Symmetry: D3
Subunit: 277 residues, 6 copies
């Protein structure tokens, strides 16, 4: 993928199998099962593939996958992990090492996105990288309630917190990369946009998980504030489409990106996610 001078790729940070009903909330199964595949256990396959962004000067990732040795044996099974992260080997394919990374931008701190931030002993994969998190997202991450406790794990704390930078509403790390507090899925959930030359790309995190969640009303049950999720989706998606943005995905098993035609119905351009088995 290329957006102007910026190169965009995905990294195999592992995968998870989550219950379809929970990933589609109010949408009846008969309808969502036709848009996304589920197994005998009502689980749909959700890759956890970080997004590698390379500008002329900086290298950065959008999330960190499920890591290596982080999830227990019970969690690996309960979360349908087929394979753990291959983020090191994948990075090599681009002549990079978990040390040439300058920024790790987080959409949110749920385990499916932050487990791969540190190895065991909570050291920290990505030692020279500055880590950016929305301030309230971070606050809840370290002080989760009886509900967010299930995904915000102490086990995911670590050294990276040394080079931690917090932002409230918006933040532009390196030119062209803009983070923006969306809320909805998470109180501190963030979306990221990439712009180089005239090209535009956007990753709406878990506020637009997969291509099957394009309908603003189709939000996951995980969303702590679904009304805010809908609000954001109702306005962002039509705008990004009108502006001919490329939609990047972290969880979609089939596609890595998509560009809808100036209409809002037909998504002509789908960039397939060729994940090695």
């Amino acid at each position: 993928m290329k957006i102007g001078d910026i190169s965009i790729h995905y990294l195999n940070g592992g995968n998870t199998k989550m219950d379809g009903g929970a990933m589609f909330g109010v949408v009846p199964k008969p309808l969502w099962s036709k848009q996304y595949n589920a197994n005998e256990r009502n689980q749909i396959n959700l890759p956890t593939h970080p997004i590698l962004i390379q500008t002329a000067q900086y290298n950065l990732i959008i999330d960190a996958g499920i890591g290596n040795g982080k999830l227990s044996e019970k969690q690996l099974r309960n979360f349908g992990v087929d394979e753990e992260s291959h983020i090191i080997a994948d990075l090599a394919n681009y002549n990079l090492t978990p040390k040439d990374i300058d920024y790790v931008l987080m959409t949110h701190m749920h385990f499916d996105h932050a487990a791969g931030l540190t190895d065991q002993a909570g050291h920290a994969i990505f030692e020279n990288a500055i880590h950016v998190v929305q301030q309230d997202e971070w606050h809840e991450f370290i002080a989760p309630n009886i509900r967010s406790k299930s995904t915000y794990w102490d086990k995911n704390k670590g050294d990276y917190s040394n080079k931690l930078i917090l932002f409230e509403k918006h933040f532009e790390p390196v030119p062209g990369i803009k983070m923006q507090h969306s809320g909805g899925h998470s109180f501190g959930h963030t979306i990221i946009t990439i712009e180089s030359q005239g090209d535009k790309a956007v990753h709406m995190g878990d506020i637009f998980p997969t291509t099957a969640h394009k309908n603003p009303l189709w939000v996951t049950a995980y969303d702590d504030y679904p009304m805010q999720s809908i609000r954001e989706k109702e306005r962002m998606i039509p705008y990004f489409i009108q502006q001919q943005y490329w939609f990047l995905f972290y969880h979609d098993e089939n596609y890595f990106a998509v560009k809808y035609s100036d209409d809002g119905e037909n998504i002509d351009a789908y960039i397939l996610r060729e994940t090695l088995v």
Copy 2:
């Protein structure tokens, strides 16, 4: 049943079938499917049974099922309606006719609770009945947003509004009956407690739909503000149990009332529903 000097019963206002996942949210099917049955279309059976309350003077009612013919063919099929409201009949079995009512107390105005409020021409099924609805709930009902439009129907508007009484935080219509605003399921969602002598009963509406939703974390995906739902459930349930309250249900297909042991671990008493 018996709640001090107050008598309580329920009415067959019809039934519906909602998608299991929509009803349990983040709870994996493998877990809730063992707590509540689902067909092959993945739907669970949910009665819409209004609760009839009678005191030495009034006989208000909680909700009004789905009604009779208020739903269209399409809707009758999409929500899996097997039988429409028998409200008029059931009420008769208690020497009460569609007119004796003294107060229709709403928990919220979603179609599965208010469609039975009027006939096909939007005329009140309950003339002479003061309809108490939470103020903010009433506003959203008559002014739905792109998501609320699915349950809030213009078609459920009617003459009953000419005897509409709104409230904010809490309201005690008749002695012993208290309506408390909870939010969660819908912004204006309300629960209702009935207390007389030493007895206590409570109906937590869609913030505690069925006995399978006892865990505060098990909230429906329909809840517009799940964080508020959990907040309310986390505090109410332990309190009502500690106080030995009877939990009344509107959508539960197996129970009408339940009373938990002094630790919430099990069901100590209960009243199944129907024949």
Copy 3:
């Protein structure tokens, strides 16, 4: 006129006559009648002249007037309409047709500002134009409450919504043109600015209706949140004046454009509206 390399005129989308006491809130008549006229109905004449902005590659329109055949017989009379929109004609006087308008920017969706967006049968005058509305202002438009119902009309919905775009706090449709959510008059009220070279112009919508509303304390009674209106006026006006901005009007029957002295106690330059 023209701000830098951007051309700007005013279209005649009709007019209306609203009560004076309504247009001046707490301001006594013995004072506002010396700044504006009160026919004997106590109505003041309020034109509904949309603003046309022409840059290098785009044609924009701020609000759309009352339209043609949109208001009923009754409305025409109560809103004191003398002449309905001549928007089509006025545009022609600029070799511009309704299909050349690239953007329609709305300050708020009240009828005197949006009625002109569609013809009857709710088709849509201005096909091909992206319609920009601030989110909350659009949410309320399609879901009015008992007070907004009077100005947010259902017959004002239309095809234009197929090319609708929403923004929350600020948005730049095209270089130099900035939309900013102000609130006050209506929860989602929005003001607009135009900048080219060192030239600056601003239209503060119904938060600064006419030149007679310059005093921040002089807000209309129509304002749903007068405290926010004052807040915005108290800060914007002094700033725009200090920056030598041209104030554009939609409702001032006399002035179209105005610029205050640095001391802002007088109007140095102005452009009258050829009624």
Copy 4:
């Protein structure tokens, strides 16, 4: 009159004449001038008659009128004052002196309601009386903003503050008398209710100024938060009517007490004010 075992009359604490457009917000003159009179200054006559409540052991007063020699030469003229307070006299007609008043309950601290609390030199009419004000209403009174500055006067501060008591949402000074924060007209606006036996009375202050403001949509332009005013009126009035409450007025030149039919479309019983 008297509610149950509580006596209630009205004192003449002076009067004022305020603009009509200001008193009726968005309501057109051709409509409000048929419900109230507009001298030619466009002013309507607003008495400032404090309400006297006498129970078994206490004497209470709601608001205090404009006082004596409190308004300057200029104010007297602009607020159309015909007669200054006769509060001392009127009280005497009840064998009551200013030192027998046990409680002074305020709806809000605007001048037409608080000017009468102290004489010049800000001493304090009504020594020995506990003065009840809602917290935020008092905070704003002593710290007015650019808009409140017009009605919250510094010369209205006084000794009475040595016996001041504040409440936030609700407060019962003496059995049967309840104060409730309503907001709307002023952030800290407060309405009051009196109950004895099955008799009920209520004074909704400036959230229901005169009988002509019964329509919830008819709020004054003075209301700093009109949306909250409507909210409160929309719910309170229907409830108070359903409960057969007597509506007491402070500003209605004609009526002092009123009671609507159950259907609330007519005024069944009333008490005129002997101007």
Copy 5:
């Protein structure tokens, strides 16, 4: 102490020495040092004495002191603890055992108030007692931020949480005892009032720590929301005085209670706190 049919007493739950400057916030030392005594280390002595309330039917406590064996050696020194809790022996003086207690009502969960809730191994002193806490207070107690972390300790969790009842704004446990959410010192801080016959008593917790904090403007620097503290004090104190309430204290070294004369200046009645050395 007797309020109508209700008997009120204090229990020696230990003590703590906190920095005076922090306990008086904006009040210059020259002024507060004359109202409360400080040592060479600027520390003032603050007893942590729970309030025993006995009605005809129920027995209850207002807080739990610093406990026994709960604070470490480093904390005992840093917090100027002279003696640890004597709550068991004190209770005996009234023919009661840490088992005859029906309700433990908490004003807030800071360590100076909640450490004595459980013994080591977090079992739970007061096994048959129902524990009442404001819902938000509790939420922060288990999910404290970088600031409240210093007083909300995991080490204070325990069995008592089994019979935990939460309330939002107000709650009346047994007739005459009314809890009320005040906020200010803590987001979930609560005050308690006692009424029997015509007698009235009130404990405003850390929103009125000692008799030296009567001036509404004299709030501790510990208060997370001082503006709300002042708001509450500005209105409550004058009202409680006008109503001839007895003010009960948990932290005042000299006095256990006080009744100001219908004025708001002279506090004629002071009930001394005879603490055994």
Copy 6:
């Protein structure tokens, strides 16, 4: 000092002595007393030194010490004033006189920052200067509450308000200078960043009073909203350090500017203050 094309210096606007505990809040004396000296009265020395900024066109100024004679005898003693403002003199050393100023940018209006804004008759020390103050800060200043009345003085009002420009979230007066609303110390508290070429400087006002307040948890007891102060400090400081910003101080007696190592552990560069 040098910040790209922008020149920065500071001025002796006088000094004060505040109680150490008030200044460090919850931080025990034994800890802060080792970070900042205190006399036997427990007071710490705090200069009130305005910061002079000069660009190729303007030369705005940050704060205005305490002034000259604005403080009374009592105040001069209670706040431990040793010397009053030498603002006029210092300004001269830079060929600038009390009139050249082009913008007085306030962080907040507490007396130790704004008393130097006017003379003994409330006349602006800085005619020709546009005074930029945060909107909400300005409101509280002119409308103090029982606690704010201690720093907000009526006596600090003046003609300067005739050139007052308010803002809400952020404002960039002249290129490179950005004012950002932070809250914390006071509701309207503002910080100011200066950036030119690759250089960056920031003055966090009373949200980072002295170098001893670097720990986000070390906030003054004066802060009306300490939780917001911590929030801002927790995020700003690490960011400004990562970006190699120069931290400018107004109250620090030893440093004027400081630059931390790339880890905040130590002070890598600095400019002491005075001779």
